[PDB]
Design a protein around this ligand. Structure first.
Ligand SMILES: CCC/C=C\C=C\CCCCCCCCC=O
Ligand SMILES: [Mg+2]
Ligand SMILES: [Mg+2]
Ligand SMILES: [Mg+2]
Ligand SMILES: [Mg+2]
Length: 141
């Protein structure tokens, strides 16, 4: 649901600053990770894909194939309030998006394409949070 997705994003997003230098992700491409969800942010830069790899690996959310680690992702989503309602759904959406981009050989590019797909499918499924909802939870933890 959109509130669980707001907690997930608020917490995950706290690793963006430490990942900027190695990914090339300028503040002028993305200032705060919560903007990922804005109507006006296009999820397209290779550098954002490199950043997401950096951020994921902090939490062991990717496996050694630079794809989502399903078990660690399920445990991560369950770590938030009401996480059990989102965990299986989110893992399903991300992995369906992964399958569409398997043929992309550049890991950074692949990951940003998966991320755009995930944003799209989350919006479609009604679980995409608004930027304001993410901001409302930024203080936590
Ligand atoms: C690894 C998933 C990132 C964890 C939580 C989600 C945060 C909000 C949006 C980030 C999109 C991540 C797309 C997964 C990419 C997998 O190839
Ligand atoms: Mg840190
Ligand atoms: Mg680099
Ligand atoms: Mg790892
Ligand atoms: Mg390349």
């Amino acid at each position: 649901t959109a509130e669980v997705m707001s907690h997930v994003t608020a917490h995950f997003g706290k690793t963006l600053e430490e990942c900027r230098e190695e990914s090339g992700l300028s503040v002028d491409i993305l200032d705060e990770f919560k903007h990922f969800w804005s109507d006006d942010f296009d999820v397209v830069h290779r550098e954002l894909g490199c950043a997401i790899i950096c951020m994921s690996n902090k939490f062991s959310l990717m496996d050694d194939d630079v794809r989502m680690h399903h078990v660690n992702m399920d445990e991560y989503i369950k770590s938030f309030p009401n996480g059990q309602v989102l965990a299986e759904k989110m893992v399903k959406l991300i992995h369906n998006c992964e399958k569409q981009f398997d043929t992309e050989t550049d890991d950074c590019t692949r990951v940003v394409k998966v991320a755009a797909c995930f944003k799209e499918d989350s919006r479609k499924e009604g679980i995409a949070p608004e930027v304001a909802m993410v901001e409302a939870v930024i203080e936590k933890y």
